[PDB]
Structure formats: structure tokens, C-alpha cells
Ligand binder design. Structure first.
Ligand SMILES: C[As](C)(=O)[O-]
Ligand SMILES: C[As](C)(=O)[O-]
Ligand SMILES: [Zn+2]
Ligand SMILES: [Zn+2]
Ligand SMILES: [Zn+2]
Ligand SMILES: [Zn+2]
Lengths: 327, 328
């Protein structure tokens, strides 16, 4: 009973404190190999990752799930290099985000299913590294292609037991349509995390989903453009709600009885080519702690607001363990 | 004077009979490495490309220019492998086609220039293989991003002497806007080929660009869905004009005195993931000669219509040599 990481199978107990939604680098397929100098160099990007992951490890983190797909420019050799150097387990993702190229965009459910199965069952590219999660996306009402991806993801997950995690536009309650399609396909909600759910203050939306058995991805806690409201690009990406506001959703879902179903993350990165230039310097200003932000700031904050230690252990250790374990 | 190929620099005279607009595999960045099974396997794609290239070489072809960009999933290692096994030179391209991912789409003119220069001056990825041509695209009126690509292409060309070749929607006369943007950047028209110009029967349009010194890319001669019109995807790709109708545009431009500005090609490929599934099968049934189509079918057609052998030699040998030669 194992979880696949970029360095091979680990037992469930080796996962430990897990960040369920992160990135080493948010990019585009082939981009890091073709234009490494965009990040200074490949090795500069690798060293910055290792630095961050090592700080994160010292704050308690033992595993990250990199939910970078093919079209987010996932580079599993990079993941494996920084994973070994930082001694942090990394889980790699299959699926598709919202920038699929034509060779993906034009594919059928059946073809998309073969591709996801391949990255899980056989390996990514020629590396033998197998994905341990499936990432999907909608950005409002699903496009016909995005529906095809949701159905292919559900099928790959039913075939392998590997779970599904999603990008939503939470302001458009995208989780509801994602849920309806997963349920028509036959996927159990306990195998699905509806992500970016911390982008909304609509508790009605989040409890309805948790009521139906979905894990709830509160995965962007440090994302805030408060204090640089005249950077339009950064305000659009990070929002104008505080990290405290986002984190209090964690407490709120615990008070409604759903601690079992929460997954907490930073949605951090060491490189971000698929947004405006120098966004990574803006982000690093806003949250200097990077991936360490959850353990160093958010856990202590929840403790101080009356959340018991056993509860936080369950969210940061047991919820990720149950979710990632294939079933 | 030298041209960069996927096996290093060659002299002008080694290029010989050159197809200026071809593909080994039309795809998407990273796609061939992530999902080789789409093409059967990497081995099966290479086998088919080497066979098709040896077929082309036996008909007289010595060089092709693969105008597959980054976002067309150009794999220069595949290009090196098949170039060498078939003993046909391949010129690799930089630039961007019309499926740029976000990491390209959001870049400034300056950033794109630096990217194109990297692939010409240094190499593609970590291979040391340098691009010998810059490929760009509009599909209608230029988007803001495509405008930035054209300007970045002009600046890369000006700095390196490497020529620019374009994708157009010919039916919307894109080459007119492409020309204005390039000229606004001070690029000489003789460094520019306006491609897919055989997709239109608009001689007024084509002769006006030729008059301004542009090279005219008649690059899809075997492309035709006549006979299989009820295949809607193939019809939209290949069109409802015969290969002979396309080839007669070559004769038309020669007749108007523009033999020196014509570039003829097949726009062929050995895999095509960035269109509908099994399109390769439709295309191969239409044109089984693949890249040998120009020398075995089009050159004898134009001879029978009274075009002199010396003019066909100019168009297939001299025009490419002059266009590909880096010239500042
Ligand atoms: C790469 As993201 C902003 O969708 O987590
Ligand atoms: C790859 As094409 C059909 O624009 O030559
Ligand atoms: Zn997302
Ligand atoms: Zn993310
Ligand atoms: Zn084209
Ligand atoms: Zn082409």
C-alpha cells in the first residue's frame, strides 16, 4: 500500500506532514528546457527550490504534492533532483490545467484516458517516474474539452485508485459542476479535492460540497495583494483578501464538523513563467516564508484561535495520507 | 557563408534542391516526449520520417527546412536522427506558430527577441543545434501577441541575417499586414517569405507583395480534399482546390516576371498531433509521395506547361540558397 513519488514508492507513514497543492515551477510544456535563462538558469531555479524546500523541511514539512501538469510545464527530472537535495518527498501529477496545447485540446475522452493512465501506470516521459495524483481545471462553466478532461480523470482514478485534485474559479462555484460530472461518471467524492476553495468567503458553497463528501482545498492561504493594490496584475492573481481571512475558513469548516475533509496548502512556487514577468519577486515579497508559511504562520494562528493540536495533526498528516493512498 | 543545419554549418552549395516549408512532425511543445504512443512510438515515427526523406532524396531533394517552432513541438534530436539516417540536410526553425502556451503568450517584444536570438546564436535547448530560419504566424488580422512575435522576428533577423518565413490566412490577405509590420521594423522584404500563399487564387495580392520584394511561399501544392469533401475536418485543412490549381500559381508568378521570388514546397509531415486524430492517414492517402511530390509531380507538370528547366532550377535551388544565406 504505497504512494508514488518522484523517487519511487514510499509507505503511507513516510508521507508525514504533507502540503497537498504546491509547485516547484509554474511554466509551460517544454519551456524550462527551451528557455532556462528566463529563470536565470535551470541550476539557479533548482538551487532556489532546494533552499525553500529545506526551510520548509526545517519547519516540519516532509512531503509536497506538485500539482503541475504537462501544460504547467512539469519537469519531473527537476522535481527528482530538488526532492533528493532537500530531502522532501515530492508527488507528481498527471492531468491537464487550463493551458492545454492543440495536441491535447483536440483529444477524445478515450485518448485523454490513455494519456493519464500512462503517466500513472507506466511513467512520465521516459523517466519511469509515476504520477500519484490527477490534476484537472475549470475556469467558470466547463468548456467541452474541460468536461472531457474531468471524465478522463474520473476514469483514470477509478482504474488506479489515484485521487483527483481540481483548479476552480471559486467565485463561480465551479466545484458544483465538477462534482456533478464526477458523480455521473461514478467517482467517490472522497477521491476528489475541490481546490482554490479559499478564494471565496461563501461558506454555503463549501459546506454543501463537504456535505456531499468532497475534500476542500484551502490551498492559497498566503495569497494576498493587500498593500500593493496599485499592481493590477498582482491584485488580479493574489486577490485583496488577507491571509488571515483565508485561514479562518479552515477554522470555520472545522466548526461545521468537517475537519476530516480539509486540505491546506500554500500554492507556492520557485518559478512562475506562465504569468507576468517578475511575478515571482512580487510573490516572494508578500510571503518570504514561501512553502514554510503554513507550518510557521498558519498552524500557530489556528492554535491561538482555539484549534486543538490533534485537529491540526489530522489536517496536515492524516487527511493527506488517506487522500493519497490509492483506493 | 554558411547555413545552420541540425548537423552543423553547411556551405550554400551543399543545400542543393531545397524544400523551404516542411515538417518532420507537427505537434505541440513537450508532446512527443510525453506521449510518443500517439504516433505508435518514437521508433515508428522516426522509421516513417527516414523512409519519407529517403523517398524525397531519391527524387532529387537534398535539403528541407523544418518550419516547426517551439509551439509546434519541434524535437531537434528527432530532426538530427532522421537527417543523418536519410542523408538529407534539415534546417531547424525558431519563432512561434499560432499555439503559443502562456509562458510565451505573456512575453514582451524584448523577451521574445532574446528567445529567438538564443535559438539562432547559441542553440535549441541544450543541444547546440542552431536555427537557420525564423517562423511566425497570423491567422487573420494580427493579435497583439502575434504583432509582438513579428517585431521580435524582424529584430532577430536584423541582428543575425537569418530569414523570416510566415504562416498566413491567405484568404484574409495577411501578408499585407505582415509586410507593414516587418517594414516598420526596417527589415528588408528580401529576408521575408509570405507563406501558404498558394491557399488563395488572388494574383493581385501575390504580385503586389512580389513587387515589394517579398518571397512568395507556394508551400502546400499537394494539399487537396477533392474526392473526399464529405470529410469536414480534412476539407477545412486541405481545401477544395486541386494540386494543379495550386501549381498553376507558380506558372502565373513566373509569367508575371517573379520567378526569382518564388519558393515552392509541400508542407508535408510524418506525424500531426496538433490536428484531428488520424489526419496523417487522410493526408498520406491524398499524397503518398509525401515530400517527393514537388520533384516527381509538380516539376514535370510545369515542364509540360512550358516552364523552362532553368527556371525550375532557379526556384528549387538558387532562390532557397539566396534566402537561407544569412545576409544583414
Ligand atoms: C498554477 As495555479 C495559479 O492555477 O495554482
Ligand atoms: C503546421 As501548418 C498546417 O500551419 O503548415
Ligand atoms: Zn490552480
Ligand atoms: Zn496550483
Ligand atoms: Zn502554417
Ligand atoms: Zn507548415
Amino acid at each position: 500500500d504505497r504512494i508514488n513519488t518522484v523517487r519511487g514508492p514510499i509507505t503511507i507513514s513516510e508521507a508525514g506532514f504533507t502540503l497537498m497543492h504546491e509547485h516547484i515551477c509554474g511554466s509551460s510544456a517544454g519551456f524550462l528546457r527551451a528557455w532556462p535563462e528566463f529563470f536565470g538558469s535551470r541550476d539557479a531555479l533548482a538551487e532556489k527550490a532546494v533552499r525553500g524546500l529545506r526551510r520548509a523541511r526545517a519547519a516540519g514539512v516532509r512531503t509536497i504534492v506538485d500539482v503541475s501538469t504537462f501544460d504547467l510545464g512539469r519537469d519531473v527530472e527537476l522535481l527528482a533532483e530538488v526532492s533528493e537535495a532537500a530531502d522532501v518527498h515530492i508527488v507528481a501529477a498527471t492531468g491537464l490545467w487550463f493551458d492545454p496545447p492543440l495536441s491535447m485540446r483536440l483529444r477524445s475522452v478515450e485518448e485523454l484516458t490513455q494519456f493519464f493512465l500512462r503517466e500513472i501506470q507506466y511513467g512520465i516521459e521516459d523517466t519511469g517516474i509515476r504520477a500519484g495524483i490527477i490534476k484537472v481545471a475549470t475556469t467558470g462553466k466547463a468548456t467541452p474539452f474541460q468536461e472531457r478532461v474531468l471524465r478522463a480523470a474520473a476514469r483514470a482514478s477509478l482504474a488506479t485508485g489515484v485521487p483527483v485534485t481540481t483548479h476552480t474559479d471559486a467565485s463561480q462555484r465551479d466545484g458544483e459542476q465538477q462534482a456533478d460530472i464526477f458523480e455521473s461518471e461514478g467517482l467517490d467524492p472522497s477521491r476528489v479535492c475541490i481546490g482554490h476553495s479559499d478564494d471565496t468567503d461563501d461558506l454555503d458553497y463549501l459546506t454543501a460540497l463537504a456535505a456531499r463528501g468532497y475534500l476542500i482545498g484551502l490551498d492559497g492561504i498566503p495569497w494576498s495583494a493587500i498593500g500593493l493594490e496599485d499592481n493590477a496584475s498582482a491584485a488580479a492573481l493574489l486577490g485583496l483578501r488577507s491571509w488571515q481571512t483565508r485561514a479562518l475558513l479552515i477554522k470555520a469548516l472545522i466548526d461545521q464538523g468537517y475537519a476530516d475533509q480539509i486540505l491546506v496548502s500554500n500554492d507556492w512556487t520557485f518559478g512562475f513563467s506562465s504569468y507576468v514577468t517578475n511575478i515571482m519577486d512580487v510573490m516572494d515579497r508578500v510571503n518570504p516564508d514561501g512553502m514554510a508559511f503554513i507550518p510557521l504562520r498558519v498552524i500557530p494562528f489556528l492554535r491561538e484561535k482555539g484549534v486543538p493540536d490533534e485537529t491540526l495533526e489530522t489536517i496536515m498528516v492524516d487527511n493527506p495520507a488517506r487522500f493519497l493512498s490509492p483506493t
